[PDB]
Design a protein around this ligand. Structure first.
Ligand SMILES: O=C(O)CNC(=O)c1n[nH]c2ccccc2c1=O
Ligand SMILES: [Fe+2]
Length: 187
């Protein structure tokens, strides 16, 4: 399954566009589970835009580990073909919560200063996101296109994009609680 998705979709889509959306990545059950785990971290005080870092062995986080393992399976089966990068690892999972008070994240590049992070991978957990009323769109400005790309933070959506200056991006103001989990893979 990872072989097929990696080589029939993620590799070609990324090499062409530098951005790749995989809807329905883990399915509604496992999704909801990860979502219930992120919410339990949050409501029990464990955020510090607020964030918390997770390795994947800590408590209340088993299924976030399964997510990370599932992401890793995709990247491993890209076979060094994704942007001709030989990927050597990734960060821990960064869980982010925009509380829903109009806050967002201003336009930025993830790796502006030349660290080894090459691919940003984000998994979204927001069921029945009403983007027209709730805001919180991810807007990416891919270098070499005169049109931006708008990505809704939809439940069980996995997203890949190049981390460097090819992809300046912003989280537009969010008016409902918005959750996402990011890892960065490095070459
Ligand atoms: O959630 C999204 O759709 C995109 N989100 C981001 O680009 C983003 N990028 N870099 C960060 C660094 C530290 C803390 C939060 C973030 C963050 O949400
Ligand atoms: Fe970012």
């Amino acid at each position: 399954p990872a072989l097929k998705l990696a080589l029939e979709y993620i590799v070609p889509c990324m090499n062409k566009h530098g951005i790749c959306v995989v809807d329905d990545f883990l399915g509604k059950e496992t999704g909801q589970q990860i979502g219930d785990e992120v919410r339990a971290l949050h409501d029990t005080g464990k955020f510090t835009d607020k964030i918390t870092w997770i390795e994947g062995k800590e408590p209340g986080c088993e299924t976030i580990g399964l997510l990370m393992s599932s992401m890793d399976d995709l990247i491993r089966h890209c076979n060094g073909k994704l942007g001709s990068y030989k990927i050597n690892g990734r960060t821990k999972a960064m869980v982010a919560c925009y509380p829903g008070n109009g806050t967002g994240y201003v336009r930025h590049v993830d790796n502006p200063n030349g660290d080894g992070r090459c691919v940003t991978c984000i998994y979204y957990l927001n069921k029945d996101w009403d983007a027209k009323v709730s805001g919180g769109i991810l807007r990416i400005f891919p270098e070499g296109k005169a049109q931006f790309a708008d990505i809704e933070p939809k439940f069980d959506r996995l997203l890949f994009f190049w981390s460097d200056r090819r992809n300046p991006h912003e989280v537009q103001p969010a008016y409902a609680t918005r959750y996402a989990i990011t890892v960065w893979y490095f070459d």
